[PDB]
């Protein structure tokens, strides 16, 4: 019952690599994407969070 | 969920002939795997049990194989009451349970070609209401055939019977459908014929005075 | 012998209510799982439901929601309870007993049962070296088959199955052949219980 | 001083098939004969010794037959584990003993038609005076794909994967080598490919990069 | 368990002399007769030499002159020592073991090992909708596969095996599937301790 949400539910959509039965990922502050990984930190060319 | 992909609808091979009918899964199911056999005048039986196992009262001519995504119901010598129509069914996942299409075994013989005749309909259905206009392809053994219509050069669906143990053939009966009397609403109405090792006439019709 | 009965299928409204019926015999039903599978006029085997030791029950997708399975520990009665019937379910359907191992396979079948949803009635069909025959129109389904010279002719007379028209009735386009070098084609009807005939000649 | 004769270097075949693998002698040597199972990515092993007698381990679908000079290793039903190459062995002459060019056994299909695709390397090597082109043939059913070079429309060795284990076709590659100075001398090239299912394509032209 | 170890294969001098070595493992050594079969590659099999229980030793047509097997009854030691290589000796040897009976057959196999007669050294390799990919010339003999993008890329990829050079070197050729409505290809050569790469972006 939240007409609003927006959040508190979030899902992966990368990392298809192997992704092992049973074995879950949390780190999600930054990843590989892009030319240059934005110095680690969010942005545009950097969209590797969830 | 799963789905079954069996052998072709129909599998035309002889008696004592080895017959291997194959149906492959659409995932890896391991040996969760059954057959069985329907003939059109009684009710199914089980031969294959876990795609290893064989049925108690099985004759020893039949033989299971395959396993994880293709499957292979192996048949060494056919007899007479081996002829009927099989399926393989997936137990790997037993809620959904799903069938394959199924597959036909028909006795193989020389290429008969049918016996085309054509009949008008009688004064009755002419005083009756919506006529109709019948052809006949009698005692064929190439069943591959199929009979459609056209007018003057609402069709209705097609009738085959049994393969008759007298001949090895098939007999196919198709009619076209029109409105009240419209028998002599045209002058010509065409039968569309088409069998192996026949001349296949496209427009099959009759010539009214 | 070890058999399993069936009755209940027949004619329904659509989505009218029904209830089938399954009686085994031969073996010990309380310790077997039974399973409901149908089987489309032209089609293969379908899965529709079944019920284990335990009294859980079990439906398919297009199943779930209308169909209602029961069995009871005594008197060796299966039954299966059908609502909101449509004309895209009308399918023989198979008593089944499911065998002893882990996974779910079919070692006894029974008799079999047909249901057929249409809302239509039983109307009477109409009679309409040389090869000719009779066309029928207007038929139903009937336990009886088609004979010639007002039912002394038998041996050489084909019936093809019959077809479904749009009025909820069927069509037969039985033949004969007679020597040409011209009988009356007797057609009759159990559920009708009238007896209708014609003839045709080379 | 003892030959052998075996079947063709391949066969082709579909799982639960029968394959009768042929084996033929120079001369009378009675049963001192064995068979052996070689998968090309492990060591080989033997099925069937004294051309009687079966390996413990093997199992029953394979059968050995024939004798003296003539030997046939027939198999009941092909599994995924059973396509590998073969060799015969005779030991009638202990010392000098002899084996079988070999027979491979893939897995049957439609015959696939190879993706003919041509692309110049970097210039990496164009730098150097040994430049080359390559020709490439892949995911093809079989194996038999002639390729040759045409200068102005040299040629060099090819190379041939494995067979895949779900698209059951072959990938070939093809190089032009050049040597000193006939990298900068000629300028046009051109791919010779011969296989079925193409239109002859003898001559597939390239320029030079 | 049941197996036979080999070692000693490796690159070697023409006319060099070399020692193979084969040690059993899992049953009676002292009791059953020991084979050596080597296979060119492309080739099949061919028996080189064996040695009997009673220390006799046979070799082949082409073999005898230049080969001399040896075995002790203890350590389970097999062994086999070459002089005077050529090229024409380039081939994969395997160890085998004689069952009982009263004629030669192979019933167990060991590793296998792979020995080269060539005068050449490792040098250092070049790597130079649509389908492309990276040509690598001077290459040598390799313990690793060539992979694309590390391996992580899930795109087409497939590498062919390498084809011989005059100078005995080798040449090696790899392909990728490349959107085309710019990966790069990792040649990790072991025996130079180098890497090289390219891309092939269009």
């Known amino acids: 019952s939240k007409p609003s949400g927006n959040y508190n539910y979030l899902y992966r959509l990368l990392r298809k690599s192997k992704l092992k039965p049973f074995e879950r990922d949390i780190s999600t502050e930054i990843y590989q994407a892009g030319n240059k990984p934005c110095n680690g930190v969010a942005g545009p060319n950097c969209y590797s969070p969830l | 969920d799963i789905q079954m992909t069996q052998s072709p609808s129909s599998l035309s091979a002889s008696l004592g002939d080895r017959v291997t009918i194959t149906c492959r899964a659409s995932q890896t199911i391991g040996r969760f795997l059954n057959w069985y056999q329907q003939k059109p005048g009684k009710a199914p039986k089980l031969?294959?049990?876990?795609?290893?196992?064989?049925?108690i009262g099985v004759p020893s001519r039949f033989s299971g194989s395959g396993s994880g995504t293709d499957f292979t119901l192996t048949i060494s010598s056919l007899q007479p009451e081996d002829f009927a129509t099989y399926y393989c069914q997936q137990s790997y996942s037993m809620p959904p349970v799903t069938f394959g299409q199924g597959t036909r075994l028909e006795i193989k013989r020389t290429v008969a070609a049918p016996s085309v005749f054509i009949f008008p309909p009688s004064d009755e259905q002419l005083k009756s209401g919506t006529a109709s206009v019948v052809c006949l392809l009698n005692n064929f053994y190439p069943r591959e055939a199929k009979v459609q219509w056209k007018v003057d050069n609402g069709n209705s669906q097609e009738s085959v019977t049994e393969q008759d143990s007298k001949d090895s053939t098939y007999s196919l009966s198709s009619t076209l459908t029109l409105s009240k009397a419209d028998y002599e609403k045209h002058k010509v109405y065409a039968c569309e014929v088409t069998h192996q090792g026949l001349s296949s006439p496209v427009t099959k019709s009759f010539n009214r005075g | 012998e070890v058999q399993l009965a069936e009755s209940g299928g027949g004619l329904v409204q659509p989505g009218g209510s029904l209830r089938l019926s399954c009686?085994?015999?031969?073996?010990?039903?309380?310790?077997?799982?039974?399973?409901?599978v149908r089987q489309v006029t032209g089609n293969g085997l379908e899965w529709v439901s079944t019920i284990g030791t335990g009294g859980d029950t079990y439906y398919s997708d297009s199943v779930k929601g209308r169909f209602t399975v029961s069995r009871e520990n005594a008197k060796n009665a299966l039954f299966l309870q059908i609502n909101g019937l449509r004309a895209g379910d009308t399918a023989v359907?198979?008593?089944?007993?499911?065998?002893?191992?882990?996974?779910?396979?079919?070692?006894?079948?029974?008799?079999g049962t047909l249901v057929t949803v249409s809302s239509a009635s039983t109307k009477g069909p109409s009679v309409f070296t040389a090869a000719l025959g009779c066309l029928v129109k207007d038929y139903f389904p009937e336990p009886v088959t088609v004979s010639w010279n007002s039912g002394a002719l038998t041996s050489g007379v084909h019936t093809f199955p019959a077809v479904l028209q749009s009025s909820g009735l069927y069509s037969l386009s039985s033949v004969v052949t007679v020597p040409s070098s011209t009988y009356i084609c007797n057609v009759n009807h159990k559920p009708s219980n009238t007896k209708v005939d014609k003839r045709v000649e080379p | 001083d003892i030959q052998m004769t075996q079947s063709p270097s391949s066969l082709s075949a579909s799982l639960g098939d029968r394959v009768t693998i042929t084996c033929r002698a120079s001369q009378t040597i009675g049963r001192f004969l064995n068979w052996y199972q070689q998968k090309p990515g492990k060591a080989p092993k033997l099925l069937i010794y004294?051309?009687?007698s079966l390996q413990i381990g093997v199992p029953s679908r394979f059968s050995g037959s024939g004798s003296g000079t003539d030997f046939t290793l027939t198999i009941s039903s092909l599994q995924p584990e059973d396509f590998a190459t073969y060799y015969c062995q005779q030991s009638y002459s202990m010392p000098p003993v002899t084996f079988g060019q070999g027979t491979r056994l893939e897995i049957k299909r439609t015959v696939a038609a190879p993706s003919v695709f041509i692309f110049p390397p970097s210039d990496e090597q164009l730098k150097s005076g040994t430049a080359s082109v390559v020709c490439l043939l892949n995911n093809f059913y079989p194996r038999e794909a002639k390729v040759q070079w045409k200068v102005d429309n040299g040629n060099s060795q090819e190379s041939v994967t494995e067979q895949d284990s779900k698209d059951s076709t072959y990938s070939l590659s093809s190089t032009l080598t050049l040597s000193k100075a006939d990298y900068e001398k000629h300028k046009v090239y051109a791919c010779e490919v011969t296989h079925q299912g193409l239109s002859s394509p003898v001559t597939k032209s390239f320029n030079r990069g | 368990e049941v197996q036979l170890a080999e070692s000693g294969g490796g690159l070697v001098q023409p006319g060099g002399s070399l020692r193979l070595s084969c040690a059993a493992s899992?049953?009676?050594?002292?009791?059953?007769?020991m084979h050596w079969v080597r296979q060119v590659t492309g080739n099949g099999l061919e028996w080189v030499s064996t040695i009997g229980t009673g220390g006799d030793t046979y070799y082949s047509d082409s073999v005898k002159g230049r080969f001399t097997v040896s075995r002790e009854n203890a350590k389970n030691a097999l062994f086999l020592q070459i002089n005077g290589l050529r090229a024409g000796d380039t081939a994969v040897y395997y160890c085998?073991?004689?069952?009982?009976?009263?004629?030669?057959?192979?019933?167990?196999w060991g590793r296998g090992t792979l020995v080269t007669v060539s005068s050449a050294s490792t040098k250092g390799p070049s790597v130079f909708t649509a389908a492309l990919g990276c040509l690598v010339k001077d290459y040598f003999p390799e313990p690793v596969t060539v992979s694309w993008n590390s391996g992580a890329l899930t795109s087409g990829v497939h590498t062919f095996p390498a084809v011989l050079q005059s100078s005995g070197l080798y040449s090696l050729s790899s392909v990728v599937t490349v959107p085309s409505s710019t990966y790069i290809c990792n040649v990790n050569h072991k025996p130079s301790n180098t890497k090289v790469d390219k891309r092939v972006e269009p």
């Open positions: 085998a073991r004689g069952g009982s009976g009263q004629f030669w057959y192979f019933d167990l």
């Open positions: 004294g051309a009687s």
């Open positions: 899992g049953f009676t050594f002292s009791t059953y007769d």
